[PDB]
Amino acid sequence: GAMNSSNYAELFNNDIKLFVDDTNVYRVTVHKTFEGNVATKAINGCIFTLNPKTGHLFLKIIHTSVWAGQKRLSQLAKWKTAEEVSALVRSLPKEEQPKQIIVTRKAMLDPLEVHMLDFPNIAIRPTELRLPFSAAMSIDKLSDVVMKATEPQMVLFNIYDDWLDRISSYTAFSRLTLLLRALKTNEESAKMILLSDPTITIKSYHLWPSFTDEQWITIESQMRDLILTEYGRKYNV
Amino acid sequence: MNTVPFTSAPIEVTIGIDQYSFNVKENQPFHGIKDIPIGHVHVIHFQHADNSSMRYGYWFDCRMGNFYIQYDPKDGLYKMMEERDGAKFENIVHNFKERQMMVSYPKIDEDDTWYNLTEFVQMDKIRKIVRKDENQFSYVDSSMTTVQENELSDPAHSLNYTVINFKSREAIRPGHEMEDFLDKSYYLNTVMLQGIFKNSSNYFGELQFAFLNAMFFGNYGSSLQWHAMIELICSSATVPKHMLDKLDEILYYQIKTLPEQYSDILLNERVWNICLYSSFQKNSLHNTEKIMENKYPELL
Numbered sequence: 001g002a003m004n005s006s007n008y009a010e011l012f013n014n015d016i017k018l019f020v021d022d023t024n025v026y027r028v029t030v031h032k033t034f035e036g037n038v039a040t041k042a043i044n045g046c047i048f049t050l051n052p053k054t055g056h057l058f059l060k061i062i063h064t065s066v067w068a069g070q071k072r073l074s075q076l077a078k079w080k081t082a083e084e085v086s087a088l089v090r091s092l093p094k095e096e097q098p099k100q101i102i103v104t105r106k107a108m109l110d111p112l113e114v115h116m117l118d119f120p121n122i123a124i125r126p127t128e129l130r131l132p133f134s135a136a137m138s139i140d141k142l143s144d145v146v147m148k149a150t151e152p153q154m155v156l157f158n159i160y161d162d163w164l165d166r167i168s169s170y171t172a173f174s175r176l177t178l179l180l181r182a183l184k185t186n187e188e189s190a191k192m193i194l195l196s197d198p199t200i201t202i203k204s205y206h207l208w209p210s211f212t213d214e215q216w217i218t219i220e221s222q223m224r225d226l227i228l229t230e231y232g233r234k235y236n237v
Numbered sequence: 238m239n240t241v242p243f244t245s246a247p248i249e250v251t252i253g254i255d256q257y258s259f260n261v262k263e264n265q266p267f268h269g270i271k272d273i274p275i276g277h278v279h280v281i282h283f284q285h286a287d288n289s290s291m292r293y294g295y296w297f298d299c300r301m302g303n304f305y306i307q308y309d310p311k312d313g314l315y316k317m318m319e320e321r322d323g324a325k326f327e328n329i330v331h332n333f334k335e336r337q338m339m340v341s342y343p344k345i346d347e348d349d350t351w352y353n354l355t356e357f358v359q360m361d362k363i364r365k366i367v368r369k370d371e372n373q374f375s376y377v378d379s380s381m382t383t384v385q386e387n388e389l390s391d392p393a394h395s396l397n398y399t400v401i402n403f404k405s406r407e408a409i410r411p412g413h414e415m416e417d418f419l420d421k422s423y424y425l426n427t428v429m430l431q432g433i434f435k436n437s438s439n440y441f442g443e444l445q446f447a448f449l450n451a452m453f454f455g456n457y458g459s460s461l462q463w464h465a466m467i468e469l470i471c472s473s474a475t476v477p478k479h480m481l482d483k484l485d486e487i488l489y490y491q492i493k494t495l496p497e498q499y500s501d502i503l504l505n506e507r508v509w510n511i512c513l514y515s516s517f518q519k520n521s522l523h524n525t526e527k528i529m530e531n532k533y534p535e536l537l
């Protein structure tokens with residue numbers, strides 16, 4: 001069924017699974033027309049499809065042209081998402097196909113279930129976790145590839161850089177989610193934390209700085225402080 | 238006007254004949270029902286006094302043979318049987334009418350309720366849904382499950398309703414996933430009407446039969462089927478105008494006839510609110526919406 005804190009280690013077992021987040025698939029700016037009306041202009045979006053065990057991110061870039069001439073775009077975004085995810089699975093060798101796809105919003109369940117009726121042995125599940133994957137566009141290199149795309153495009157990343165050489169999947173997922181939570185709550189401070197030291201660099205083939213283990217502990221603590229605090233400045237406590 | 242003679246009434250039982258019902262007391266001199274309207278299907282059904290569990294009953298058409306009810310003390314039920322000796326049956330019935338041992342099917346002349354609830358129901362189609370080929374009549378009870386229920390355990394005693402499943406390959410064309418799921422016209426018109434049912438009279442017939450079995454027997458899977466078939470129409474943007482008009486009438490009389498006190502279990506809140514207020518046909522069921530809102534405003 002659904003996914004919550006009670007079956008949390010399941011993410012890191014040896015059944016292939018992906019999260020699918022659609023919160024950045026349809027993105028708009030809202031602006032005033034010459035007539036003083038309001039209108040939306042769409043910008044490029046992305047499907048955030050993530051193996052939580054390997055860190056492999058299938059980042060399907062959603063180019064604005066996919067919306068041209070279409071109505072009910074929030075509803076189509078969910079069906080577009082499910083079409084792209086279905087196509088993704090179909091392109092993987094059987095032994096690479098997920099046994100489960102977990103959607104981060106319940107409104108993706110029916111669009112994905114329908115697009116995957118071909119795949120009865122793939123379980124489509126919601127989750128009760130409030131995962132911060134929407135902040136994925138606060139990762140500079142991801143944001144950069146989305147905004148520069150001139151056509152539909154799929155780009156592959158390892159959202160964990162090389163961490164799995166030193167830590168477990170569980171721990172790496174916990175680090176990613178703390179970093180994304182931090183970026184979602186206060187992007188500026190989160191980003192100040194990550195780069196406050198000019199001697200720590202982001203390797204060309206990575207998304208996050210090259211922190212040592214001890215530096216990661218300091219960072220992780222600082223991010224916790226941020227999340228605690230902003231939650232202070234938010235509920236005045 | 239035909240007659241269903243009972244051999245006797247050895248156990249106390251409430252007898253239903255279509256939408257009418259009467260209490261028979263244990264070993265009362267009851268010998269059946271007379272003046273039954275020719276030209277319609279009928280259902281005679283039974284709730285024993287001692288065990289309100291298991292309503293059961295018999296769909297039949299008096300044109301298809303001479304039928305009687307004989308209590309079976311082994312299986313413990315009133316059983317519908319056929320007399321092929323036509324003259325012997327005539328004599329048996331004549332004798333019980335001469336002694337006035339029969340209740341009279343009490344149809345009011347203004348009253349088209351039974352016709353309106355059974356317009357498209359025909360025995361031949363009932364016998365396809367309820368498979369017991371050796372009898373011209375069809376037994377149904379509360380506990381019988383449906384072919385679709387058995388796919389989610391005895392196949393002989395099931396209700397072979399047409400399986401409708403909105404998240405199925407048959408309902409969804411490859412490459413039209415969104416289109417077919419949000420507008421079920423393909424599934425209704427091509428798959429079900431043109432493909433399976435052939436016409437809308439067969440479809441409405443199953444729909445009415447499902448409703449009646451749900452209402453008379455509290456058969457849960459019949460109730461699911463009735464709602465499913467309504468929803469398939471209401472969630473199709475493209476439906477023949479004559480089907481929509483007829484559906485409105487059908488549903489109107491079903492809702493009118495429902496027992497007010499059973500509405501909470503027989504009526505599915507989600508399906509009806511969707512159909513009346515969200516669906517493509519939200520504006521096409523004027524009589525049904527008017528009676529629903531005046532009689533069961535609570536559900537909505």
Ligand SMILES: C[C@@H](N)Cc1c[nH]c2ccccc12
Nearest residue numbers: 242243244305307320326329
């Ligand atoms: C012992 C039973 N077979 C008696 C019976 C045979 N035919 C009938 C028709 C009407 C009512 C009773 C009967």
